[PDB]
Enzyme design. Structure first.
Site: not given
Length: 469
Positions: A210, A256, A389, A431
């Site tokens: 992540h 991301e 998400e 999420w």
């Protein structure tokens, strides 16, 4: 007189897209063509002694391929250059073991996606890091206020009707050796114990690397070598630890990816090239371990996990197996409703029921349908899509009519996003960060927000039970 050095008469390319500069020593006028569309010359017509590029497209055909490049000039014999491009191959690892389809069903990622249905994140947990002002990382899975994921939580998730859990994971706060990115075995053990509990509960499980402080958020050529090396070193370890798990365990390479140095600038072609490259590094690394990892379903991310950027800029990695890759996007539009902080100018309401009220200027029903339906380009190309998400915060400081309208708006929004994903064959993962937006009590696994769980299930079943023309 038309001359081309012997060194240029038989060119060899690997499976990647790439280029080679050659030299043509020709007369006042000469010409070049090629025999195949995937092999291009920079020049069609030329003069004198010229540097000419021969460029190949990436070879995703899983066969060696060949072409010719023909150089010609009036009254001179043609010069015909051979071009050979190899099929895709994985890096060579000493730890490699032969492919193994044990527990690996003969299903495309698309077919697998249809079994996955819907799910939830165990957010703000294994990816929780304390980040210092110099980028230093510390903490463990409890450092953002959640307990260790447990058996009763995963059982509760399954019991509520979810079939997939995404488990964000951080590792870079748990290195035994920082310089080599060696991860502590004791940390890997904790991650594995949670994965095992989730699988034993009957769930599909997705693990990633992540954000964990943002080290990957430099998609530029100046940092590509270091970032690619680190991403490989980390994924090699994780892939080896989890290699013998069956096809219910999926890996997601990144989260991301953004350029953290560019202050919200529009990304550049360099940024897309380097970020698409990270996806390729991840695939290469997992496949290079072999065993069941030869066949595992892998999940690669759009730039910023952004839908419009996926459509415009995402490229499929090359792979050694057919149809075992998913695309991942995240979806939080409209931001001022879903996740904008409470100390900013948030909108508490959403949707047709509140038109004329405290609603956002964008991201209402039509906008959500347009954006999520734009992913049809992937679905129709046999590439499944996980919405890894989505979901709105719960603004528990609100009172009275404003609170009631907010609670309703969240559930209307949730149902609408879910139904739109179902219509478009996308897999929606909610999420849950264990805070006011949570669906479950993390300690007991009991439902926390029955109404929001019900909104998701209504969205899942809307068009199956209540269908019309």
């Amino acid at each position: 007189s038309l001359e081309v050095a012997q060194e240029y008469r038989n060119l060899e390319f690997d499976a990647r897209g790439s280029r080679q500069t050659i030299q043509i020593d020709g007369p006042a006028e000469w010409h070049i063509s090629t025999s195949e569309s995937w092999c291009k010359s920079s020049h069609t017509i030329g003069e004198g002694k010229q540097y000419v590029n021969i460029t190949v497209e990436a070879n995703d055909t899983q066969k060696e391929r060949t072409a010719t490049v023909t150089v010609s000039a009036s009254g001179a014999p043609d010069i015909i250059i051979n071009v050979k491009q190899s099929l895709y191959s994985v890096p060579a690892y000493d730890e490699y073991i032969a492919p193994d389809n044990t527990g690996m069903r003969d299903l495309t990622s698309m077919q697998l996606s249809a079994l996955m249905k819907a799910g939830v994140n165990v957010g703000n947990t294994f990816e929780a890091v304390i980040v210092g002002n110099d980028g230093s990382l510390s903490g463990d899975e409890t450092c953002w206020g959640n307990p260790t994921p447990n058996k009763v939580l995963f059982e509760g998730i399954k019991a509520a009707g979810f079939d997939v859990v995404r488990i964000p994971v951080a590792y870079s706060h748990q290195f035994e050796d920082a310089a080599t990115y060696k991860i502590k075995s004791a940390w890997m053990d904790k991650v594995e114990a949670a994965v095992k509990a989730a699988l034993d509960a009957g769930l599909y499980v997705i693990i990633n690397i992540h954000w964990e402080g943002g080290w990957l958020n430099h998609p530029v050529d100046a940092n590509k070598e270091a970032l690619d090396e680190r991403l490989e070193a980390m994924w090699k370890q994780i892939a080896l630890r989890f290699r013998d798990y069956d096809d219910r365990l999926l890996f997601a390479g990144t989260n991301e990816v953004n350029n953290d140095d560019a202050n919200g600038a529009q990304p550049t072609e360099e940024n897309y090239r380097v970020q698409n490259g990270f996806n390729q590094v991840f695939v290469n690394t997992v496949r290079a371990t072999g065993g069941r990892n030869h066949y595992r379903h892998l999940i690669v991310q759009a730039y910023n996990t952004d839908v419009a950027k996926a459509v415009a800029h995402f490229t499929m990695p090359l792979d050694i197996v057919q149809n075992r890759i998913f695309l991942e996007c995240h979806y939080y539009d409209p931001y001022d409703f879903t996740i904008m902080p409470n100390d900013e100018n948030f909108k508490s309401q959403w949707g047709a029921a509140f038109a004329g009220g405290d609603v956002s200027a964008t991201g209402q029903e039509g906008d959500i349908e347009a954006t999520l339906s734009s992913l049809n380009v992937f679905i129709n190309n046999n590439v499944p899509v996980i919405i890894g998400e989505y979901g709105p915060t719960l603004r528990d400081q609100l009172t009275g009519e404003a609170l009631e309208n907010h609670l309703k708006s969240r559930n209307d929004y949730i149902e609408y996003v879910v139904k739109t994903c179902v219509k478009n064959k996308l897999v929606p993962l909610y999420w849950d960060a264990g805070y006011t937006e949570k669906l479950f009590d993390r300690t007991t696994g009991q439902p926390h927000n029955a109404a929001s769980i019900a909104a998701i299930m209504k969205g899942l079943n809307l068009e199956h039970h209540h269908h019309h023309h």
